[PDB]
Design a protein around this nucleic acid. Structure first.
Ligand SMILES: [Zn+2]
Lengths: 126, 136, 49, 59, 182, 79, 192
RNA sequence: GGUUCCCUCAACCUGGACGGCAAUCAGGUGUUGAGUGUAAGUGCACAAGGGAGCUUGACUGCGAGACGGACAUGUCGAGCAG
């Protein structure tokens, strides 16, 4: 019988991110007029959503799991630009033109900053 | 004489003398006990006089329990002074007793000497009281 | 007085725009700080008299 | 590793009195060091001039 | 390209050595070494500033990186200690730089101790970590004995993934720590 | 001898000014307090000295969110 | 151990409250409640003198068979409300039980015998918990202090329980603590 | 003081050169018992508590709507522009 003594770094990392995501969400919130752009990052992919916090409903969502994004022959940040452009097309196809950015806890920079600037040049303003 | 080591507040209002006792109305340790039938403030001087009276009757054997403690101070202002200028310094410690409370207990092998011993203690207290046992 | 009252003046128009306090033991020198000067109309360096 | 806050650190080479040699990295600017006791020399690992002075003049 | 000798030795001579001895279910349960931390509690730095300055000078030579200067987190009158002033130093080592230090500590410094009699195996930290101290600091070849002022020992501690002390000893003796027979 | 006591300070008239269901204007004071015994809710702000005031006209409504007592302002529908 | 249920006549109350319960007591009755796995509490009334006679001769854990408007019902006495001063029985809880059901019950332990003449007996715990059948609850539990010398902690795990009765309280309670009898100098110093 | 970002204490158990109950180091338990310049109370772990970077809003012209009130005083405030 094996009995681990402490906490794996995965558990420490996970609870620390949710800790600093809630500290973020004490200010930003989603409304139908000005939705919220939630981004989730992993070691393989990146996800975005447009959430309306008034009733807890998701408007549009783009992700790196889509077949067309996988075909890109760049690095991880090259797929983040592709994912950012998809959400901007889907955001404006539902009448949304202004959003607020929810970085999800992660540091703003690198992959996250690549996605946001891809969705800024594509029409969304935030 | 029983005296608390320290009390947080030295000069306190008078304990209220309304209602009947909520807890302590039964015998837990000994075989016989003294149950109160009136409200009063039982001073530590009366408690000491009332458990010595129990001691002098059972002599050697047996055990005595005291279920109340003089926690609450009563102040007296200095003699032959006019009213005013503060509140007096505490003098004697009392225990707020309500009807139904069990004050003393005793555990002695025979009954007559134990019931006689508790009666000597009742005559030292400023209240009506009775002897109770552990049975319903 | 340890904490006396000091007047900060613009370094361009020499107008006495603010008054505050400082500890003249922790800050033996004249306090240098930027504050809005209404006469100039922009944030300018203000130095203690 | 920050740039200009750490001691200068270069690969070295240790040579012992038993002929053993390693290939390690340390802080010594020389590039090599020589030691007379190693893992192969000290008695506690192996289990095997004052000594020579009494063993030469007196026997 | 290449690896430190201990990491090379640990990778495919030590890892599977523990496999049959303890009969693990996953390779993820094989213990390793996490980090090594070198400490010097100066203590008497409350009296002079030169004391703390000397310790951080030597500790860079021993390991190969700049140390911290651990400040006191409490004011103690009995020790003439006021919170907020240097009291010690600390260096942690990870990755390659850890393995060389473990290489040199066993090979060179440890046998250089006068009348060396190994290290006690009972100093384990309950859950599989080992710590030990030195009364001096001259057992390192990266210092010059002439320049040495006073003894200033360390507190070497080795952090492992082993669950218990039984598995903690097994990993450390494989590296080559000279445990006494007791 | 004498008494060393006898001091006190002016009562500050703290408390809930507008109660549940009571229609208020914008900027109107709802609760005067020291700490956040009551936290602000929707359309309610907190002042410099921890005063809760309405940010929009409506009706007062007390609630509870994540273990915290809150004060909320709900709109009144025009006829 | 087997018991015979005690017959009692229970009348369903019409009005409940503090005013109605006080009036019922003045007429020589005790309000009572019949809950349990019936899961529909009945607010009953019992004759005050007849109910207390059953308690006198059978103890607090008395099995009862009640007559509610012509229908019988096995009931157990769960708790009693007693005035501290008047020693009344102001209320009573009745728990519905069926034959073969196991219920956890507190029974009294009695001390008997005559120990060493130089010792004093001090019983610490008045009751211990058991778990017996509906009709197989002992009416008392007996312990013996005979020839017991000096300090002995008689323990709750050393009480001779009948068959089919399992101790529920932990087996390390101190029930009877025989001790050397206090002397005239031990009396004086204790309590000052 | 302003803002942006990061963090979780006290106590207890175990192992360590001087070193001891208590200095610095390591692992575990630990949901607030620590801390908040300063009395007490109401609060604060979502931190208002600990750490770091830049900084002067410790502004100018104003201020719908309110609290409290013998009067004179006193207090809160969204929002507009520079
Ligand atoms: Zn100017």
């Amino acid at each position: 019988a094996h009995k681990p003594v402490g906490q794996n770094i995965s558990e420490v990392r996970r609870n620390a991110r949710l800790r600093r995501h809630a500290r973020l969400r004490k200010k930003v919130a989603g409304t139908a007029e000005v939705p919220r752009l939630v981004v989730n990052r992993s070691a393989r992919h990146i996800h975005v959503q447009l959430v309306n916090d008034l009733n807890g409903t998701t408007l549009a969502a783009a992700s790196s799991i889509e077949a067309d994004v996988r075909a890109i022959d760049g690095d991880k940040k090259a797929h983040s630009v592709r994912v950012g452009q998809l959400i901007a097309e889907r955001a404006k196809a539902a009448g949304v033109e202004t959003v607020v950015f929810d970085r999800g806890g992660y540091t703003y920079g690198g992959r996250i900053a690549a996605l946001a600037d891809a969705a800024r040049e594509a029409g969304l303003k935030f | 004489m029983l005296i608390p080591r320290k009390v947080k507040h030295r000069k306190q209002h008078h304990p209220e003398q309304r209602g009947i006792a909520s807890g302590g109305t039964s015998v837990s340790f000994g075989d016989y006990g003294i149950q109160a039938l009136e409200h009063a403030y039982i001073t530590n001087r009366q408690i000491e006089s009332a458990r010595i009276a129990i001691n002098r009757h059972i002599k050697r054997g047996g055990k005595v329990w005291i279920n109340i403690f003089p926690d609450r101070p009563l102040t007296k202002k200095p003699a032959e002074t006019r009213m005013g200028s503060g509140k007096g310094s505490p003098e004697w410690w009392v225990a707020n007793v309500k009807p139904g409370r069990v004050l003393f207990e005793l555990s002695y092998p025979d009954e007559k000497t134990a019931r006689d011993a508790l009666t000597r203690a009742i005559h030292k207290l400023p209240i009506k009281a009775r002897i109770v046992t552990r049975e319903e | 007085d340890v904490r006396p009252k000091i007047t900060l003046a613009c370094e361009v128009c020499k107008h006495r725009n603010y008054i505050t306090k400082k500890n003249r033991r922790n800050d033996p020198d004249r306090l240098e700080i930027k504050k809005f000067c209404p006469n100039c109309g922009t944030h300018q360096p203000h130095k203690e008299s | 590793m920050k740039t200009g806050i750490h001691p200068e650190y270069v690969d070295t080479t240790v040579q012992c009195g038993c002929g053993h040699s390693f290939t390690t990295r340390s802080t010594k600017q020389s590039g090599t060091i020589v030691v007379e006791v190693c893992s192969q020399c000290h008695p506690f690992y192996t289990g095997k001039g004052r000594v020579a002075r009494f063993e030469k003049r007196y026997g | 390209k290449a690896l430190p000798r201990l990491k090379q030795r640990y990778r495919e001579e030590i890892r599977e050595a523990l496999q049959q001895e303890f009969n693990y279910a996953n390779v993820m349960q094989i213990p390793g070494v996490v980090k090594v931390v070198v400490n010097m509690g100066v203590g008497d730095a409350a009296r002079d500033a030169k004391l703390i300055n000397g310790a951080i000078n030597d500790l860079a030579l021993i390991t190969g990186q700049k140390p911290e200067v651990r400040r006191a987190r409490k004011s103690i009158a009995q020790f003439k200690l006021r919170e907020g002033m240097p009291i010690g130093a600390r260096v942690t080592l990870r990755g390659d730089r850890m393995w060389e230090f473990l290489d040199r500590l066993i090979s060179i410094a440890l046998p250089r101790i006068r009348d060396f009699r190994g290290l006690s195996p009972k100093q384990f930290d309950g859950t599989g970590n080992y710590t030990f101290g030195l009364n001096e600091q001259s057992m390192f070849h990266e210092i010059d004995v002439d320049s040495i002022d006073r003894p200033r020992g360390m507190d070497i501690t080795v952090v492992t993934t082993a669950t218990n002390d039984a598995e903690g000893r097994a990993l450390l003796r494989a590296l080559g720590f000279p445990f006494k027979e007791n | 001898s004498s008494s060393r006591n006898g001091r006190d300070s002016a009562a500050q008239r703290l408390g809930v000014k507008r109660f549940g269901g009571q229609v208020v204007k914008a900027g109107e004071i709802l609760v005067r307090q020291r700490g956040t015994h009551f936290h602000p809710g929707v359309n309610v702000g907190r002042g410099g000295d921890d005063t809760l005031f309405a940010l929009a006209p409506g009706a007062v409504e007390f609630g509870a969110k994540r273990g915290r007592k809150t004060v909320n302002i709900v709109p009144v529908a025009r006829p | 151990t087997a018991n015979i249920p005690n017959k009692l006549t229970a009348n369903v109350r019409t009005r409940t409250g503090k005013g109605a319960s006080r009036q019922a007591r003045r007429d020589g009755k005790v309000p009572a409640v019949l809950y349990g796995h019936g899961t529909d509490p009945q607010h009953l009334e019992l004759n005050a003198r007849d109910f207390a006679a059953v308690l006198r001769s059978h103890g607090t854990n008395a099995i009862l068979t009640l007559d509610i408007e012509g229908t019988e019902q096995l009931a157990l006495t769960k708790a009693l409300d007693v005035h501290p001063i008047r020693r009344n029985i102001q209320h009573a809880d009745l728990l519905v039980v069926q034959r073969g059901e196991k219920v956890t019950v507190e029974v009294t332990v009695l001390v008997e015998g005559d120990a060493t003449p130089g010792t004093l007996v001090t019983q610490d715990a008045n009751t211990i918990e058991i778990e017996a059948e509906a009709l197989s609850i002992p009416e008392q539990l007996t312990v013996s202090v005979e020839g017991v010398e000096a300090g002995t902690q008689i323990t709750a795990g050393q009480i001779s329980l009948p068959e089919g009765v399992n101790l529920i309280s932990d087996p390390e309670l101190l029930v009877v603590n025989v001790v050397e009898a206090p002397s005239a100098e031990a009396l004086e110093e204790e309590g000052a």
